C-alpha cells in the first residue's frame, strides 16, 4: 500500500495550498482515516490535521483555523488544505494512513513553498584562521552566509585576486527558523600556505549582487 | 508523555543498532502503541515497526523482516528496537513514537509525542571528536557596535555535535550553522554570536561543545584581540 505525494508545491499568501495524498487503488480514499504531519528542519514531525470527512475531523495542537481537509473520490486522493497562506507555513508535510494492523503507511512528503518573500541579500562573515589551529600547521578559513533569499548561492574563494580551487567545501544551503537560508564554506589549507599571500576573499553571489569579504595574513 | 531516547549513535557495519525509549507520564503496559520511525539524511519517514502496550504483540515493516526486534521493559517503563546486521540503508534519524490503540477515537491514532531523534550514522571508521577553536572577532568590528565571534567544530565523526554559548545563558544573536563533509569523511561546524562591542570589556565569551560519540566536551573562551 502506497501514499504519493508531489515532491514540491507553490502557493500564494492568502490563497490556499493544496496539497495531494494519492492513495494507491487497493484502498478507498473515502472511509480511510488521513493523518498530515508538519515538519520543519531540527524538530520531530508534529501531527496537523486528523481527516476522515467534514463531519469529523480535527487539527492538530496548536495548528491554526485555517486549515482543513478534503477528499477526492475519483482521483482517489486526500488533500491538505492550508488558507491565508503565511510564510511560517513553509515546511514539510507527510500524509499518513494505517492499515489493517496499525502499521504506520507514509508518504515521502511534500515541501510547501509560500511565494512572495521578499528577497534578501547574504550577511556575510569570514573568519582567519586562529593562531591555536596555525600552531597545529594548518589553516581553515571559515566563510559564515546568512539570511538570504532566495536560498541559491555561488561561492568563490580568491587569493591575491586570483581563484582558489583547491581546498574548498560549501555547504548546500539550508532553511533557517525565519525562513531565510544559510550556507558557509571553508577554504582548508596549510600554514605555510596562508601566509604566503597578502589577502584572501570569500566572494558570495546571491542573484547577481556579490558580497565580498576579505582577511589579510598580516594581522 | 514524555519520550525520551537513547542508544549509540555509530553502529558498525553489519552489527546491531539498539536504541531504547523511556516514557513518563503514561505507563507503557497499560496501553497505546509504541513505535519506532526513521528519517534517512534528506528524505521522508520510513515506518519501522510497533509494540502494544498492553498485549506486547509487535508489527514490523515487512521490508526490516528478521532483522527487527521491539520489545518493552517495564520494569523500567521503556521500550526498545534493536535491527542487526545494518548497512548504509540504515544510517537514518531514528524517532520513537506513540499512538493510541484501535477503539480509541481515530483523532488518538495520529503519532501524538515523539522522541528527540536519535542520529544513527552506519560506518566502520571510529570516531573522532572535534578539536575547537576560538574566533577572534575582527578588531575593526570591535571598533565598531557590534562584533561577531565565534566557534570553529573541526574535524569531527560522526554527527551530532551541540554547540552553547556561556553555559547556555548566551542565546540572543546565537547561529550555529550545518556542518560541512570534508573530503576526508570528516565533519566541520561553526558556531558565531553578535554582541555589543561594549559588552566584550565586561563579559566571557565561551563557547561549549558538545560531542557524545566521542565522549568530548570543551568549553573555548574566545579571546579578544586588538591586532
Request: proline share 7%; glycine share 8%.
Amino acid at each position: 500500500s502506497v501514499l504519493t505525494q508531489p515532491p514540491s508545491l507553490s502557493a500564494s499568501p492568502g490563497a490556499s495550498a493544496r496539497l495531494p495524498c494519492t492513495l494507491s487503488s487497493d484502498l478507498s480514499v473515502g472511509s480511510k482515516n488521513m493523518y498530515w504531519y508538519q515538519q520543519k528542519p531540527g524538530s520531530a514531525p508534529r501531527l496537523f490535521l486528523y481527516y476522515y470527512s467534514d463531519s469529523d475531523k480535527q487539527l492538530g495542537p496548536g495548528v491554526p483555523n485555517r486549515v482543513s481537509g478534503s477528499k477526492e473520490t475519483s482521483s482517489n486522493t486526500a488533500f491538505l488544505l492550508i488558507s491565508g497562506l503565511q510564510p511560517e507555513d513553509e515546511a514539510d508535510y507527510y500524509c499518513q494512513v494505517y492499515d489493517g494492523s496499525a502499521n504506520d503507511v507514509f508518504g515521502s512528503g511534500t515541501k510547501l513553498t509560500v511565494l512572495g518573500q521578499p528577497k534578501a541579500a547574504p550577511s556575510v562573515t569570514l573568519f582567519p584562521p586562529s593562531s591555536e589551529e596555525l600552531q597545529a600547521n594548518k589553516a581553515t578559513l571559515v566563510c559564515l552566509i546568512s539570511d538570504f533569499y532566495p536560498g541559491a548561492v555561488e561561492v568563490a574563494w580568491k587569493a591575491d585576486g586570483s581563484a582558489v580551487n583547491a581546498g574548498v567545501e560549501t555547504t548546500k544551503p539550508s532553511k533557517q527558523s525565519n525562513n531565510k537560508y544559510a550556507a558557509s564554506s571553508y577554504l582548508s589549507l596549510t600554514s605555510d600556505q596562508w601566509k604566503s599571500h597578502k589577502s584572501y576573499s570569500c566572494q558570495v553571489t546571491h542573484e547577481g549582487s556579490t558580497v565580498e569579504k576579505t582577511v589579510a595574513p598580516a594581522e | 508523555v514524555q519520550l525520551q531516547e537513547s542508544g549509540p549513535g555509530l553502529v558498525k557495519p553489519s552489527e546491531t543498532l539498539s536504541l531504547t525509549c523511556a516514557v513518563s507520564g503514561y505507563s507503557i503496559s497499560s496501553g497505546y502503541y509504541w513505535g519506532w520511525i526513521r528519517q534517512p539524511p534528506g528524505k521522508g519517514l520510513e515506518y519501522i515497526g510497533y509494540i502494544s502496550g498492553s498485549s506486547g504483540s509487535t508489527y514490523y515493516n515487512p521490508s526490516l523482516k528478521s532483522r527487527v526486534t521491539i520489545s518493552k521493559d517495564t520494569s523500567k517503563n521503556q521500550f526498545s528496537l534493536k535491527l542487526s546486521s545494518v548497512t548504509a540503508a540504515d544510517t537514518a534519524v531514528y524517532y520513537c513514537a506513540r499512538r493510541d490503540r484501535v477503539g480509541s477515537y481515530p483523532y488518538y491514532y495520529g503519532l501524538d509525542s515523539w522522541g528527540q531523534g536519535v542520529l544513527v550514522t552506519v560506518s566502520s571508521a571510529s570516531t573522532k571528536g572535534p578539536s575547537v577553536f576560538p574566533l577572534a572577532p575582527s578588531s575593526r568590528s570591535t571598533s565598531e557596535s557590534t562584533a561577531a565571534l565565534g566557534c570553529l567544530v573541526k574535524d569531527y565523526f560522526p554527527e551530532p555535535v551541540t554547540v552553547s554559548w556561556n553555559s547556555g545563558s548566551l542565546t540572543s544573536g546565537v547561529h550555529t550553522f550545518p556542518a560541512v563533509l570534508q573530503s576526508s569523511g570528516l565533519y566541520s561546524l561553526s558556531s558565531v554570536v553578535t554582541v555589543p562591542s561594549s559588552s566584550l570589556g565586561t563579559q566571557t565569551y565561551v563557547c561549549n561543545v558538545n560531542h557524545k560519540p566521542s565522549n568530548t566536551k570543551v568549553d573555548k573562551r574566545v579571546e579578544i584581540k586588538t591586532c
